[PDB]
Curated annotation (Swiss-Prot):
Cellular-component GO terms for this entry: cytoplasm; cytosol
Family (UniProt): Belongs to the MMACHC family.
Gene Ontology molecular function, alphabetical: cobalamin binding; cyanocobalamin reductase (cyanide-eliminating) (NADP+) activity; demethylase activity; FAD binding; glutathione binding; oxidoreductase activity; protein homodimerization activity; transferase activity, transferring alkyl or aryl (other than methyl) groups
Tissues with expression: Widely expressed. Expressed at higher level in fetal liver. Also expressed in spleen, lymph node, thymus and bone marrow. Weakly or not expressed in peripheral blood leukocytes.
Effect after changing residue 158 to Q: In MAHCC; results in decreased stability and reduced stabilization induced by cobalamin binding; has reduced affinity for cyanocobalamin and reduced activity in dealkylation of methylcobalamin
Disease affiliated with this protein: Methylmalonic aciduria and homocystinuria, cblC type: An autosomal recessive disorder of cobalamin metabolism characterized by decreased levels of the coenzymes adenosylcobalamin (AdoCbl) and methylcobalamin (MeCbl). Affected individuals may have developmental, hematologic, neurologic, metabolic, ophthalmologic, and dermatologic clinical findings. Although considered a disease of infancy or childhood, some individuals develop symptoms in adulthood.
Gene: MMACHC
Record's protein name: Cyanocobalamin reductase / alkylcobalamin dealkylase
Main location per the UniProt record: cytoplasm
Sorted UniProt keywords: Cobalamin, Cobalt, Cytoplasm, Disease variant, FAD, Flavoprotein, FMN, NADP, Oxidoreductase, Phosphoprotein, Transferase
Subunit note: Monomer in the absence of bound substrate. Homodimer; dimerization is triggered by binding to FMN or adenosylcobalamin. Interacts with LMBRD1 and ABCD4; the interaction ensures the transport of cobalamin from the lysosome to the cytoplasm. Forms a multiprotein complex with MMADHC, MTR and MTRR; the interaction with MTR could modulate MMACHC-dependent processing of cobalamin. Heterodimer with MMADHC; the interaction might play a role in the regulation of the balance between AdoCbl and MeCbl synthesis.
Subcellular localization: Cytoplasm, Cytosol
């Protein structure tokens, strides 16, 4: 049933530069404090949606031609919301829930922790400071980063599709690939992401099959307020 649902979501999103990964809500919830839990039974089927370098040309550029563009609204976020809504139309027999990466509660807290979802769905290994022995950074924020086995850091997590009522307690956990296994490279990756993310270099932590085009890089280098 998972393969049938996966095919329906893939037929909707994969031609537009997206990738889809199944997971159980339990895997996500067990790694997090109760504050960040999804209010669903553990065996509930969920899909992690990410965007590849192809989504800029296949989804965003054609979307910037639609009659959907709104004033003071981010075009990428509108584009992602639109395609996630198309998943809803592909499954009329099901009542589905969709949470995008950019969504926040009234208190400005993220609705989902996109990187924890990407890790448990086996999409991209989530590297944190707790994955570095003898943590050398001290009392400062060291934000974690997911590395995709094919695109390195040349991707983005865009959302989760939740299927309440679809329970898969026997869904096998598929561990994400530990593409950055040594301490030295994990330190270089975490420092590249936290202190030099503007030079795009951390995204090459794994040799990518494809990078963002120079046009896509020029678009994303522009602050959202100026897009
Ligand atoms: C708010 C936020 C920021 C803030 C704060 C920094 C941060 N990363 O939190 C600011 C504005 C500074 C920031 C900057 C950037 N952002 Co940002 N961050 C966002 C966002 C929206 C929320 C992250 C968050 O609130 N984390 C909260 C903390 C508490 O969570 P945590 O560290 O993971 O801790 C939890 C886990 O450790 C878990 N846990 C415990 N034990 C274990 C064990 C395992 C095995 C696992 C998996 C989990 C786990 O429990 C903890 C919670 O208690 C996420 C998207 C999202 N919705 O998640 C993007 C996001 C992480 N950022 C992204 C990026 C790329 C960036 C930038 C490079 C800028 C850009 N190009 O957009 C920069 C620079 C990098 C940086 N400094 O983080 C991408 C990262 C993609 C990736 N992983 O490759 C994300 C995922 C958005 C996306 N659409 O893809 N961002
Ligand atoms: C009036 C309040 O202000 C906004 N708001 C902005 N930041 C916060 C926060 N940290 N906690 C709660 N609400 C917040 C909400 O939108 C709410 O309506």
């Amino acid at each position: 049933k998972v393969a049938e649902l996966k095919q329906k979501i893939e037929d909707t999103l994969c031609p537009f530069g997206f990738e889809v990964y199944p997971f159980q809500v339990a895997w996500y919830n067990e790694l997090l404090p109760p504050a960040f839990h999804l209010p669903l039974p553990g065996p509930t089927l969920a899909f992690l949606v990410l965007s590849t370098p192809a989504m800029f040309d296949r989804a965003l550029k054609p979307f910037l031609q639609s009659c959907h563009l709104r004033m003071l609204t981010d075009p990428v976020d509108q584009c992602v919301a639109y395609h996630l809504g198309r998943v809803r139309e592909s499954l009329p027999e099901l009542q589905i829930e969709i949470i995008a990466d950019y969504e926040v509660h009234p208190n400005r807290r993220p609705k989902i922790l996109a990187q924890t979802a990407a890790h448990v769905a086996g999409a991209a290994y989530y590297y944190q400071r707790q994955d570095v022995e003898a943590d050398p950074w001290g009392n400062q924020r060291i934000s974690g980063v997911c590395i995709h086995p094919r695109f390195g850091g040349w991707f983005a997590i865009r959302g989760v599709v939740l299927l309440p009522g679809i329970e898969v307690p026997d869904l096998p956990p598929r561990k994400p690939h530990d593409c950055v296994p040594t301490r030295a490279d994990r330190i270089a990756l975490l420092e590249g992401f936290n202190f030099h993310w503007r030079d795009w270099t951390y995204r090459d932590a794994v040799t990518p099959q494809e990078r963002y085009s120079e046009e896509q890089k020029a678009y994303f280098s522009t602050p959202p307020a100026q897009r």
